[PDB]
Amino acid sequence: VFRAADPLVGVFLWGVAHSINELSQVPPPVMLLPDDFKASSKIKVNNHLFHRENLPSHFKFKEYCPQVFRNLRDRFGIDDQDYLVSLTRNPPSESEGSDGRFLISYDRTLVIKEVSSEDIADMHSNLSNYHQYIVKCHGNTLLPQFLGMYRVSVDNEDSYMLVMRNMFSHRLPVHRKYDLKGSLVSREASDKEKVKELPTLKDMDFLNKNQKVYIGEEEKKIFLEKLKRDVEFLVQLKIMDYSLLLGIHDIIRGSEPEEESFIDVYAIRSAEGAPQKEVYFMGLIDILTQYDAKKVHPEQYAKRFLDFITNIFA
């Protein structure tokens, strides 16, 4: 059943418009109540002998905790209308690498990742904790910015979408990619992964390449003290198995002929004495994983993580 447009994205793009447009009529609550953290807005469409081109005739769309995620976007500095333009003005571009879908907004500021149903449950188990941490740090963090969480039902099949700020650059393309855990049971990018154009390298590949990150001592201090706070928050929640996403843009290799419009929140320029002029992009990914696993405590995972990351700097 080849289609030119994927109905899963079309229904998602429809539902984001509908969600935000109805949200424009609902005044923001003065304080989020514990009921807002179990709330949801669903809507089910049933057209009969009335066909549309972009959307299927039978679909559902649900938004998880609208008031919570609306408040989160605000605290992260994103106007709801800017969120809408960025996701819907033009179709997002598809990216490969992750399990299911992984979309990038047309302005390359937002990311939309397909997650599982247990991931949706893990977010609810800690949305209140995550929100209270965004309040406390005023949104200045290395954790991902969870901006919206949605369920898209099409052809009697539910997909779960999660929107976030893009940790990479809206305009500077990433030339080298790592995912760093600091672990012992060592991590190499597979042969299958390594022959791609942009392979996600891991701890051992980082070391094998003599990779170092040159940012200068003040930025190093701010980044490590931030990383330390964020990790302690996860440790308190008994979380482990998270990663630092590290991207590297080669400056002299440049972008395409495309050279103020947006701020790359997770970017740090290289130090003035660096051997290479580059831009780094760093963020924690795959948080929200509890220690309970059916065959390392969160405190030990963290200490090892922080010590590894501390030494990637030079």
Ligand X SMILES: CCCCC(=O)Nc1ccc(-c2ccc3ncn(CCC)c(=O)c3c2)cn1
Active site residues: 113, 241
- How far apart, in whole angstroms, are the C-alpha atoms of residue 56 and residue 15? 13
Dihedral of the CA atoms 13, 37, 245, 236 (nearest 10)? 180
Q: In angstroms, what is the minimal distance from the CB of 45 to ligand X?
A: 25
Q: Which letter, b or e, does each residue of 45-75 get, where b requires 16 or more Cβ atoms within 10 Å of its Cβ?
A: beeeeeeeeebbeebbbbbbbbbbbbbbbee
Specify whether the CB–CB gap between 55 and 154 falls below 8 A.
no
Residue 156 as a binder of a copy of itself (CB under 8 A): the answer is no
What token pair was written down for 260? 């103020």
Residue 217 as a binder of a copy of itself (CB under 8 A): the answer is no
Residues 284-303 that bind ligand X (CB under 6 A): 285-288
Q: In angstroms, what is the minimal distance from the CB of 283 to ligand X?
A: 6
Residues 98-157 that bind ligand X (CB under 6 A): 111, 113, 115, 119, 122-123, 144
- How far apart, in whole angstroms, are the C-alpha atoms of residue 189 and residue 290? 25
Residue 161 as a binder of ligand X (CB under 6 A): the answer is no
Residue 48 as a binder of a copy of itself (CB under 8 A): the answer is yes
Q: In angstroms, what is the minimal distance from the CB of 26 to a copy of itself?
A: 5
Report CA torsion sign: 234, 176, 148, 45: negative
Residues 1-30 as x/- pattern, contact with a copy of itself by CB under 8 A: ---------------------x--xx----
Residue 123 or 302: the one with the smaller Cβ distance to ligand X is 123
Choose which of 166, 169, 243, 270 interacts with ligand X (CB under 6 A). Answer: 166
Give Cβ neighbours of residue 173 (< 8 Å, ≥ 6 apart): 249, 255, 256
Residue 162 or 309: the one with the smaller Cβ distance to ligand X is 162
From 10-18, 75-83, 223-231, 283-291, span contacting ligand X (CB under 6 A): 283-291
Residue 42 as a binder of a copy of itself (CB under 8 A): the answer is yes
Q: In angstroms, what is the minimal distance from the CB of 175 to a copy of itself?
A: 40
From 33-41, 132-140, 206-214, 250-258, span contacting a copy of itself (CB under 8 A): 33-41
Specify whether the CB–CB gap between 158 and 59 falls below 8 A.
no
Q: Position 33: which residue type?
A: L
- How far apart, in whole angstroms, are the C-alpha atoms of residue 134 and residue 164? 14
Q: In angstroms, what is the minimal distance from the CB of 27 to ligand X?
A: 28
